[PDB]
Design a protein around this ligand. Structure first.
Ligand SMILES: *[B@@]1([O])O[C]([C]C([O])=O)[C][C][C]1[N]C(=O)[C]C1=[C][C]=[C]S1
Length: 503
């Protein structure tokens, strides 16, 4: 062709990601894709070796590259490059060589908030995390310019900007970067001190459904993905599922206290620390108990004790409460890869299955779902829908546990933390805190769990700590996960200026 008119799209400035307070988490930065028309390059061949030397490329490899695709009017010398480099090569004055301002994501907080934020690909398109989930919102409208081109394809003149580019829109996350840094630091230190393989920490606003912090280990630097494992990129809080074990006994207890058949001072005999359901044997971890009250059952995490309560009230009431607090249910966060886990239902709940559900096995949940459950319980039985985006207008919650029952369970979990034989390492200096330890087995390999909230008497914050496969001789949730809860809850309450309730 003697001439032709071609589409070139005006790229959009991709929307700024901030934290709830406007700290920048993902920032669109000027770069420049050095490109070339081979057809024009093919008539300045003595200029190539210098060009190559400034693209650092091998002289003969470069020249082979330009040769093979001589016909094409387009080739990328580099993708991205500062508006600095890009000029250093423009000032060469090589025929068929140009620079064109692009946008590249920078992530100022780096590894600290990688799983939540995720990242864009070579093309400034969301690929993981918030970047993908909210791509539409963040990506603007590419505009369009009609350009007249000579025989070779060199832009002679620009005819019209027919439709300008529209910038993408700012997104403010629920994340509080200050809590996120603290959670990140303490989860990393807890892994080191226990030689654990992995972990997750979630902090929630029990009043707004906002995720204030979501950190996992291992993590990666999104600014430098060069050499990086598939494992280190798992948002484990959202896309990994586990058996919550003893951390859902409190929901089994909500059911019990809602049935009308149980009150806290009621007694269950759990002797001799085991119980046969035909060929199946329920085993307590500790087996030096006969009579325990309902608080003791939680303090001892007695599987026998919670199974006998379950046989009494029925699996249906237990299933119903766990369903309503959202365990194994769709959170509606539309996070890429986000799991729903499994809350298995039954027409006929047999005995074995009644017991396993009640003591926290046979179901699988995310750390985010468990945090959300603990939020509902902390917010006086009222579940607010989860959000990763800042909540200005808090939606109506659903009352999923009676306020009075919620209040009783709150008081019992405060005792689990504060009473003799309790999870004393979960205590939070000059606050009342409430919560529940858990330990799962997966050749002994543990998952170590703590879920709780504070302040105990007027809750603000729900927190889950999950440490995968601690390596020292301590593996119990109350040993491994509780101290991280203590430290990160104490920090979060201070940072949000929450009044101490233990004076
Ligand atoms: B539960 O998940 O966690 C309890 C321990 C805690 O509160 O930290 C013990 C009972 C439940 N776990 C199990 O029964 C499975 C295990 C077997 C041996 C140690 S954990």
């Amino acid at each position: 062709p003697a001439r032709s008119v071609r589409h070139i799209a005006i790229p959009a400035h991709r929307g700024l990601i901030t934290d709830r307070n406007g700290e920048p988490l993902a920032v669109s930065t000027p770069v420049t894709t050095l490109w070339a028309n081979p057809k024009e390059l093919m008539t300045a061949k003595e200029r190539w070796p210098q060009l190559a030397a400034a693209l650092g490329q091998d002289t003969k490899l470069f020249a082979d590259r330009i040769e093979q695709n001589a016909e094409r009017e387009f080739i990328y010398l580099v993708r991205g490059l500062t508006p600095e480099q890009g000029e250093g090569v423009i000032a060469l004055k090589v025929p068929g060589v140009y620079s064109i301002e692009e946008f590249r994501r920078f992530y100022p907080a780096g590894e600290v908030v990688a799983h939540a934020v995720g990242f864009t690909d070579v093309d400034d398109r969301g690929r993981e995390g918030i970047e993908l989930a909210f791509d539409e919102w963040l990506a603007g409208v590419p505009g369009k310019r009609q350009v007249l081109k000579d025989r070779r394809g060199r832009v002679i003149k620009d005819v019209q900007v027919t439709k300008n580019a529209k910038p993408g829109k700012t997104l403010a996350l629920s994340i509080d970067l200050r809590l996120q840094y603290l959670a990140h630091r303490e989860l990393r230190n807890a892994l080191l001190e226990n030689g654990a393989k992995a972990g997750s920490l979630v902090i929630m606003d029990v009043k707004t459904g906002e995720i204030l912090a979501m950190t996992n280990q291992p993590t990666y630097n999104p600014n430098n993905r060069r050499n990086l494992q598939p494992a280190a990129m798992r948002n484990r809080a959202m896309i990994d599922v586990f058996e919550p074990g003893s951390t859902v006994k409190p929901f089994s207890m909500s059911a019990a206290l809602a049935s009308g058949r149980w009150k806290p001072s009621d007694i269950v005999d759990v002797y001799p620390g085991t119980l046969q359901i035909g060929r199946y044997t329920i085993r307590d971890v500790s087996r030096n108990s006969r009579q325990l009250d309902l608080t003791g059952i939680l303090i001892k995490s007695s599987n026998v004790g919670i199974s006998k309560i379950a046989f009494d009230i029925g699996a249906e009431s237990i299933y119903s409460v766990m369903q309503q607090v959202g365990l194994g249910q769709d959170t509606g966060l539309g996070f890429p890869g986000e799991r729903v886990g499994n809350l298995p239902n039954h027409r006929k709940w047999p005995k074995a299955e009644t017991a396993t559900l009640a003591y926290g096995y046979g179901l699988s949940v995310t750390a985010i779902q468990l945090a959300h459950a603990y939020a509902a319980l902390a917010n006086d039985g009222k579940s607010v829908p989860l959000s990763m985006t800042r909540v200005d207008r808090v939606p109506d919650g659903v009352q999923v546990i009676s306020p009075e029952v919620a209040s009783t369970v709150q008081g019992m979990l405060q005792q689990v933390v504060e009473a003799q034989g309790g999870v004393f390492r979960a205590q939070v200096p000059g606050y009342h805190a409430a919560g529940k330890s858990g330990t799962a087995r997966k050749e002994n390999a543990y998952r170590s769990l703590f879920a709780g909230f504070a302040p105990a008497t007027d809750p603000r914050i729900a927190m889950v700590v999950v440490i995968d496969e601690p390596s020292k001789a301590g593996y119990f949730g109350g040993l491994v996960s509780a101290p991280v809860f203590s430290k990160v809850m104490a920090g979060a309450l201070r940072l949000m200026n929450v009044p101490p309730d233990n004076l």
